Amino acid sequence: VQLNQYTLKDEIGKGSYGVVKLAYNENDNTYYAMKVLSKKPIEQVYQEIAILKKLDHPNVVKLVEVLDDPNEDHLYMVFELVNQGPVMEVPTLKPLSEDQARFYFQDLIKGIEYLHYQKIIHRDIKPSNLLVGEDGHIKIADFGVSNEFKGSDALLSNTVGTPAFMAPESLSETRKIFSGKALDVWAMGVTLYCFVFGQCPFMDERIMCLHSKIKSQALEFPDQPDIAEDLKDLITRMLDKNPESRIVVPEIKLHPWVTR
């Protein structure tokens, strides 16, 4: 499979939309990641590309070029490869150590904080969108459902992303308005829980009960592995079900587990 100067190889990931394939560029003799999309509405992909074109940061993926012929049904986004892949698979029986989780969480904070400064709400923070680069650091991937905003926060009404990671205030069925920065914080908390426990804090195979637990089940910590109380404190604050009192990113940065 050859698309201009690129040679498509095997699938390496499957995102919110198309697939990602390893691609080899014959010009410069280099591997890239290629998101492959087929027109199935189509507006949102060019919102994604616009957001991508604006982002230049070491903890965010780098869009290299877009291949769009008006005649072929497929559309290609070329990203710089992030070779080690997702930071972890969820669920797992081998979660990260606290020191590992701290290391990666620190990257996650700097990226989210950059995104929020650039006025992007990511809306799909989770371990499989956190890719480990050549140097061992995290890069945030997949802006397929992200939101851009004007002013100091986003004022959202739609429900998107991955169910297990959706903040409770995005799950009223009366179409209410909710702010966007707190949605990313919630997902960071579910993510940090996954790092150290290897599974999600709210699991159910019936979607109705997964929503019910997210909205109404008190956060429970497993006996094993026994984690530090300050890490418990931080997760508890990020998974505060009330977005008004949920911890903000400038406070997360100062948290004693984080600076430890």
Ligand SMILES: O=C1c2ccccc2S(=O)(=O)c2cc(-c3nnn[nH]3)ccc21
């Ligand atoms: O290098 C990537 C990679 C490398 C190894 C394994 C798995 C992936 S990957 O498919 O998870 C991915 C996804 C994106 C992406 N960014 N925005 N939408 N998709 C960009 C790069 C990569």
Ligand SMILES: [Cl-]
């Ligand atoms: Cl995941």
